Amino acid sequence: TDRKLVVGLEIGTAKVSALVGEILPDGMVNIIGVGNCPSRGMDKGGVNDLESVVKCVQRAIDQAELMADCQISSVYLALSGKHISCQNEIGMVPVSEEEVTQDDVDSVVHTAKSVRVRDEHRILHVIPQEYAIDYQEGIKNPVGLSGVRMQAKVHLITCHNDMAKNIVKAVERCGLKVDQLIFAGLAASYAVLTEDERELGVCVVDIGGGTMDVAVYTGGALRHTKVIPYAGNVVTSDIAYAFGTPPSDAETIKVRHGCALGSIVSKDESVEVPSVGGRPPRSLQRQTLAEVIEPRYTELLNLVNDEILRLQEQLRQQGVKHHLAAGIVLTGGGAQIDGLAECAQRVFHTQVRIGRPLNITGLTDYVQAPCYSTAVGLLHYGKESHLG
Ligand SMILES: Nc1ncnc2c1ncn2[C@@H]1O[C@H](COP(=O)(O)OP(=O)(O)O)[C@@H](O)[C@H]1O
Ligand SMILES: [Mg+2]
């Protein structure tokens, strides 16, 4: 008769995004409300001023609430940060009456997640990877099948206990309930990935301001989750230091004229820059600016490439699919720079594409930017939370 709504909120380093979407019978999300606000009160270490973030959240909430003609009461909250980690466990149970029932599934996943976890961490996501019923490896939906012993591979995403307290207080002080805390990198791949790319094998890199969220899917299952604490802010620091310009201006010139490949930028495109110390403005070439951006971006993607390969090795020792036939998907705000899909192709030596949010309709023009990957992914994750 009506409409099922899902609202996602991302309190980022520079933007606070609130998205309102309808669940359609398709499985697509009809985005009917957008809310943007400059994220005031958050360092990269986290929240430094609660009252500022409360006004920021309710501002973004009020705009999307009015644009959608609804009443937001609960949200799906994103969560980024340095102290996010992962681990993989393996459980095994005797199959009840030699036919896999739901209680068989629930206990083997329970015995996998009931393990010692990284010092000062709690389980944020319990994601089963695949099941093995009597040496039929790689089973996704195993309920109903026959067998004696069943193995389950479960992927655990863990986070520090306190790293969410501030942003939960911020949202709760706006009269809103937190439906669930979602890892930002997880929601990102929910938005930019197709299901066949997970089957073929892919690696998503959510490139924000302070973190690079990396997820690796092989054989249709999430294999790895890694947070690298170096992103677009380190690139901005290079421009501010290599040219002697305020970081507020180094951020402007990077988004306005930056490029990850000095190979493709012309020699006659010249940019102007305000200098520090009240000293006269300087004039540099777009190519020279790209010659500063390229070494850092290459170094960052090599950190991801180094993480992909050593994971691929350990997967080879375990007899699990490992090849990334779908390639690399770079997403996030830091992935929107020119020439990046080409700079990454020289690093990973495979197909690279810049992914935007998928599977959406309505106000798609407002959230089609790769920086909206996490925000849209909160809508899809919450949609899957409903139908289940
Ligand atoms: N057109 C662009 N070119 C290069 N970098 C960009 C561009 N747009 C945004 N960025 C970078 O992306 C980062 C912000 O991405 P975002 O996903 O909003 O961060 P977070 O996930 O931490 O909130 C900033 O560091 C910014 O410099
Ligand atoms: Mg982002």
Numbering used by the authors: 5 to 392
What does the paper say about this structure?
During bacterial cell division, filaments of tubulin-like FtsZ form the Z-ring, which is the cytoplasmic scaffold for divisome assembly. In Escherichia coli, actin homologue FtsA anchors the Z-ring to the membrane and recruits divisome components, including bitopic FtsN.
The EcFtsA1-405 and XpFtsA1-396 structures showed single protofilaments with a “loose” longitudinal contact between the IIA and IIB subdomains.
